[PDB]
Amino acid sequence: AAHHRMRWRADGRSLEKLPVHMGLVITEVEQEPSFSDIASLVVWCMAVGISYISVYDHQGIFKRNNSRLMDEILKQQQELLGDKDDQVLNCHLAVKVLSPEDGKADIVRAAQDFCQLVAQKQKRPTDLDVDTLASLLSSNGCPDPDLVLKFGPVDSTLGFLPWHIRLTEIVSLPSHLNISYEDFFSALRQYAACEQRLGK
Amino acid sequence: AAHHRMRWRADGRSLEKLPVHMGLVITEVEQEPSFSDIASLVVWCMAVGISYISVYDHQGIFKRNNSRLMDEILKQQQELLGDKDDQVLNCHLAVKVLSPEDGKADIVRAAQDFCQLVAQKQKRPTDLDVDTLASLLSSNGCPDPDLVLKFGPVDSTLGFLPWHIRLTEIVSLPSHLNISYEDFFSALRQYAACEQRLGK
Amino acid sequence: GELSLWERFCANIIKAGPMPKHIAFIMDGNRRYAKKCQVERQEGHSQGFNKLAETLRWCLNLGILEVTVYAFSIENFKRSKSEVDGLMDLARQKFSRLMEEKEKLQKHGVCIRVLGDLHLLPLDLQELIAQAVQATKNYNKCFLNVCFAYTSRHEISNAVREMAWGVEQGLLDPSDISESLLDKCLYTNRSPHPDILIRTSGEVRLSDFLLWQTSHSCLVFQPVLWPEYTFWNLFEAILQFQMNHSVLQKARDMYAEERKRQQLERDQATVTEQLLREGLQASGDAQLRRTRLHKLSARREERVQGFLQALELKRADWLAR
Amino acid sequence: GELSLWERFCANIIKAGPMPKHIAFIMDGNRRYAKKCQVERQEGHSQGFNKLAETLRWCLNLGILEVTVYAFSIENFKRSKSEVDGLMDLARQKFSRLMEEKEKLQKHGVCIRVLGDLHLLPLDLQELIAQAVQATKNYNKCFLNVCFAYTSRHEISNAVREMAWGVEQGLLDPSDISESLLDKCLYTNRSPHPDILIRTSGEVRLSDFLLWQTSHSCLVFQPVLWPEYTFWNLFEAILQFQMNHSVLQKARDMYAEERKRQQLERDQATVTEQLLREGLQASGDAQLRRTRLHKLSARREERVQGFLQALELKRADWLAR
Ligand SMILES: CC(C)=CCC/C(C)=C\CC/C(C)=C\CC/C(C)=C/CSP(=O)(O)OP(=O)(O)O
Numbered sequence A, B: 001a002a003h004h005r006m007r008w009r010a011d012g013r014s015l016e017k018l019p020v021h022m023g024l025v026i027t028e029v030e031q032e033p034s035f036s037d038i039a040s041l042v043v044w045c046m047a048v049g050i051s052y053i054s055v056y057d058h059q060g061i062f063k064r065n066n067s068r069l070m071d072e073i074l075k076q077q078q079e080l081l082g083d084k085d086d087q088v089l090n091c092h093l094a095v096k097v098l099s100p101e102d103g104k105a106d107i108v109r110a111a112q113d114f115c116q117l118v119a120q121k122q123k124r125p126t127d128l129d130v131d132t133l134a135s136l137l138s139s140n141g142c143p144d145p146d147l148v149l150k151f152g153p154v155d156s157t158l159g160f161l162p163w164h165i166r167l168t169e170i171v172s173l174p175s176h177l178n179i180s181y182e183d184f185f186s187a188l189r190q191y192a193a194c195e196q197r198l199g200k
Numbered sequence C, D: 001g002e003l004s005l006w007e008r009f010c011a012n013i014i015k016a017g018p019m020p021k022h023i024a025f026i027m028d029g030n031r032r033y034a035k036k037c038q039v040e041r042q043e044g045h046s047q048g049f050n051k052l053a054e055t056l057r058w059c060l061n062l063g064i065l066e067v068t069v070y071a072f073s074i075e076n077f078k079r080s081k082s083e084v085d086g087l088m089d090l091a092r093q094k095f096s097r098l099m100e101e102k103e104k105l106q107k108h109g110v111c112i113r114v115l116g117d118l119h120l121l122p123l124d125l126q127e128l129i130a131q132a133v134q135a136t137k138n139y140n141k142c143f144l145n146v147c148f149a150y151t152s153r154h155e156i157s158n159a160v161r162e163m164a165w166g167v168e169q170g171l172l173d174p175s176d177i178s179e180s181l182l183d184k185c186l187y188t189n190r191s192p193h194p195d196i197l198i199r200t201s202g203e204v205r206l207s208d209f210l211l212w213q214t215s216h217s218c219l220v221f222q223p224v225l226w227p228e229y230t231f232w233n234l235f236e237a238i239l240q241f242q243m244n245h246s247v248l249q250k251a252r253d254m255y256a257e258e259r260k261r262q263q264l265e266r267d268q269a270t271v272t273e274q275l276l277r278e279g280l281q282a283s284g285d286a287q288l289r290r291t292r293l294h295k296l297s298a299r300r301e302e303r304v305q306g307f308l309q310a311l312e313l314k315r316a317d318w319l320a321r
């Protein structure tokens, strides 16, 4: 266990850059997703040093099966990697399970909250700039996703956090269904090699 | 006005018997009902000495147009018959506008209320007899209809107060649409001539 | 007892259209008939029975396989002892002649049900009745319900009492009480509501008969006295039914669709309140409103189906005997 | 600029299937192209414009009559003055050559829209832009949206600011804010969301372009540098769209049906709360839930349609000029 944990950490450190926040986007709807394969992806992310992982599907299947997914993550976070409540708390802090309502519907919700403050004479329309709106998005204190792994045949983000993916690198794999560590890590070195010029 | 009022009162008193409570059942659904004809029926009932009038249709049209119906009754209770708030209060006491939910749904409601008392150990199942159930029917203190005038082509009461019509005389007229006082009063003398033996 | 040429021909014609599956009869006018024929009142009622047997054969020949008859009202207990005893003795004859005539009951699949507050009848009559009912259960080719010592208010009151018993025994929540549940606690719970209600003699009232069950039935009031009923009176009543049938069934269906709509609105308001008290949102991708709604209905159905199974167990406890 | 035989033939074939109505382009890679051809960076961008004109003719020949292009990001203001001025001067040439070439704009019905935080551009450039937009409105045969000094977060922030202005001015209630309302306050409010988003060069990111509008668009990342774009690159992108189209439109429709479902649940929970506080029942024959629900929606629509009419009035206030 101390060997497998050390190896995955050295793997993450060997890359030119690591994502602080990764998104997992599943587009395949021809079958119920494989919880054991999603959990392996999540556990690899944590073991290589990625702080946050967002799991997403446009049908909300993962959101309606939150407990089964977390339980699968916890199980595989043992066996691999070798205080249960501490392990539970540390996965709830690192793993967000998202559905479409966390994108556009959440931006609308922030707009409602802000506009009611204007209605109460506590804010003005001009008080809302880019960074202010990001502050009340419902995803505050968490960084934007640097890397999204999109699995399946749909060439679309399918509603995944449109505000947050402004600079996200999008890497596509054909399927998550029997995903291997080597395939996952191949995507990591693709992100490590990408060059972001930020408009300059 | 004093002549028309006196004439209708003598008409009611001339009959062998008068209904204390009359029901008006409208089955015709081939056109919106005529409020002015229903109101004339109601005003005749009051002027001949009938204490309560229930207006009913199985679609709930009169219930969803309560104000238009009452306003039409009040208007025709003037002109015919010659303190507006007193006239308003006296029509609200005499005129009930019913829909199907006042029959079976109300009996079910009384059953719910009674069964929750059993659940609270304040009543026993055997405490509910015929007269007890009638006491909590939602139509308490009001007499049962003696006479129902059914208008239109349907040979059914269409959900009208099934518990209350156990001994009600049912007289059928083909239409309410241009109803005349003579036609209404003809139905009254039909009820006056009926013989109720009460099982003996 | 087959049909004549004209009766058979006319039967074939109206059978091309909708036919009632269930007819209910208030057999009124026996005593006026006796006064008109100058016979003792007992033979007015005996003639009344012979007409019941004849009319049942007509229904059978028409494919109407379920009939409900008002044979004795609780209110009729207020008549003279001479008349009450005469009626009780008539019931003692026919229900006993229903025995001996068994096997002829089995061969034709005749189920006999007797509905009412039967504990008011003489103890011996209750035994004969229980025998006839016990023997003709499991038979299913035709059904005759005899309302004996019956009123509708007494039946409705009993249904509510049974629901209150289920609550008292823990099989029922007060929120589970519904129009449909009350339907399944009536004495008539094994038959559909009647398509036609027929009352003979000149009376235009229901006299506490099947008030809940006939709320949407086609009502036929015919002047003829019951011992004088003919095939053509029955034919006329069916003719009334067929002319009312399209508007009556649309109203019957609109009522049903409106009840289910209102129940869905009530249930989803319940789910809303439980969700609002909780931090949880009115709607969401998790669709927890939709699963709370299915559990609310499913737990309700399981409680009701368990209550009904227990109600039928204590109903079929006779034994009474 | 007509199509060649092979291009025309292939166009006819794919036109038998679903075709995109609107395509969006991130025209990336001009500077790497200049380094590869050993030319000054200004001619890399000028070659970039010539390719835009060529590609637009291809879309027209394909029946794609609405195109949106990323021409200048607010982030691009961070480049050297030499490069920023070079791009501004290129815009000064083309937008001025868009004039003189009028009437040729009217004859072909070309509407030009320029979207972004235009107050950041040189004052003179804003005047040329406003001229081009003012002249080509009312034209409706094809539509080209030039995103100039644009980012998507700045566009989204502005849309919310306009909704907050409507509240501050009394035309809007905070409860009226919706996904659809925000849609109608974006700079792109006169065009449907793009069917395809195309980004050239090797980059697999969106760089703050049409984030809200392309949430359900087919995304195509092609390695070619923008000045080297060919008809067949465009053809390949449309091929991607057609292979994604059935699953993508089902998801696009499921999203829409799920949003309307959740809105109906939220509105009817609102009607429930207002009804519960009041003595009034959750359901009833009066169907007051159903009329409260229609008034809630209708008063919302009238407020929104009044706010949008006022927003378009102050948008069309240039005058700017
Ligand atoms: C239980 C029992 C008695 C018999 C069982 C057999 C059976 C099903 C029926 C036999 C008795 C039959 C057919 C009819 C009698 C029912 C009855 C009291 C009718 C009222 S006629 P009213 O007396 O009211 O005459 P008017 O109105 O003219 O005064």
Ligand SMILES: CC(C)=CCC/C(C)=C\CC/C(C)=C\CC/C(C)=C/CSP(=O)(O)OP(=O)(O)O
Binding pocket: D027, D028, D029, D030, D031, D032, D033, D045, D048, D049, D050, D052, D069, D070, D071, D072, D073, D076, D087, D088, D090, D091, D094, D146, D148, D201
């Ligand atoms: C407003 C204006 C300038 C022109 C108006 C006319 C118009 C619609 C377009 C002209 C300019 C055109 C076609 C493209 C320039 C847009 C641009 C900055 C592209 C990034 S290529 P990068 O520089 O990033 O090169 P690499 O990524 O390889 O480094």
Ligand SMILES: C=C(C)CCSP(=O)(O)OP(=O)(O)O
Binding pocket: A196, A197, A198, A199, A200, D026, D027, D028, D029, D070, D071, D072, D073, D076, D203, D207
């Ligand atoms: C005007 C444009 C097409 C800007 C979008 S492409 P740009 O090269 O600026 O995107 P970055 O690599 O993030 O710098």
Ligand SMILES: C=C(C)CCSP(=O)(O)OP(=O)(O)O
Binding pocket: B196, B197, B198, B199, B200, C026, C027, C028, C029, C070, C071, C072, C073, C076, C203, C207
């Ligand atoms: C057994 C029955 C058919 C009773 C119902 S008919 P009955 O003559 O008793 O009805 P009333 O005129 O109210 O007395």
Ligand SMILES: [Mg+2]
Binding pocket: C028, C029, C030
């Ligand atoms: Mg009688």
Ligand SMILES: [Mg+2]
Binding pocket: D028, D029, D030
């Ligand atoms: Mg670039």
